[PDB]
Amino acid sequence: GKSASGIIMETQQAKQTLADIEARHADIMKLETSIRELHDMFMDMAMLVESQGEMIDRIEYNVEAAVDYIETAKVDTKKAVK
Amino acid sequence: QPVQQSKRLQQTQAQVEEVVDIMRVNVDKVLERDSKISELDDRADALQAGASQFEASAGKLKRKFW
């Protein structure tokens, strides 16, 4: 009386739309997982290249003497005359 | 040939995955580089001393006679 057979299909179409909907959803969700991944890798490069950063800073200070030594003592071997 | 216009979502999907692989390679390479850059913080200090030894052998060599 209030609808009967009408409210019968007003659902058939609903179940469809929800089916179209969750469908699109899965695509998007799928894209979002690949993106988390691309994201995770990008974030690791920046923490990695930032580590090897300190290994290029110290490896600096230490060569900021290494040759500076074979320099301070470079001349000291001039007594090849004396 | 022309742009692309039939499944722009999947397109990005795919377009995103290629980038993922280009990055599996970069993460990998940054690893071979993290190791190499280890043998350097060693031999560095391992030569930062190899010199701090050729020095005293001159300050003392000099100061002495020869």
């Binding site: 995770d40 890798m41 690791d44 990695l48 580590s51 | 599996r24 993460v27 990998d28 690893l31 993290d34 190791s35 280890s38 913080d41 060693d42 200090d45 391992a46 001393a49």
Partner: peptide, 28 residues
């Protein structure tokens, strides 16, 4: 050896980070 200690003791944790990362993505 005093130096070769910190040298191998460091490389360790470096390997702890290498694998952890290398596996996280599936390498070899």
């Amino acid at each position: 050896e005093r130096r070769k200690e910190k040298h191998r003791k460091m490389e360790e944790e470096r390997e702890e980070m290498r694998q952890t990362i290398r596996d996280k993505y599936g390498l070899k």
